[PDB]
Amino acid sequence: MIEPIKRTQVVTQTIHYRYEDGAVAHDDHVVSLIFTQSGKRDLTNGKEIWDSKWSLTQTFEALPSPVIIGYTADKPMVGPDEVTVDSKNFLDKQNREETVIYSAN
């Protein structure tokens, strides 16, 4: 006798926008990718069974950098970035984070 169980991993991408002097050039851009694997639990002995070869990939779509008059971003566009979560390393954080710098043109 088994029952369904599940687990979720959330990976987020945080993009910072600053000027060379460190001044915030634009609000941060945050997005998330939610990964959920299904499994079963034995009602008799409590064993949780997960498919060892389970794997899922999703993509943080390309994120064009905001255009700011008078300056130019060192990274005109961020991503795309493919993130994969598998059963064997399910509990491992993979959040992305970077900063785009604007230099007076």
Quote the domain boundaries for residue 72.
Answer: 2-105
Instruction: Please tell me the experimental approach by which this structure was elucidated.
Output: X-ray
Whichever domain contains 23, its CATH number is 2.60.40.4300
What does this entry list as its resolution, in Å? 2.4
How is residue 48 written in tokens? 């949780």
> How many separate domains does the chain show?
1
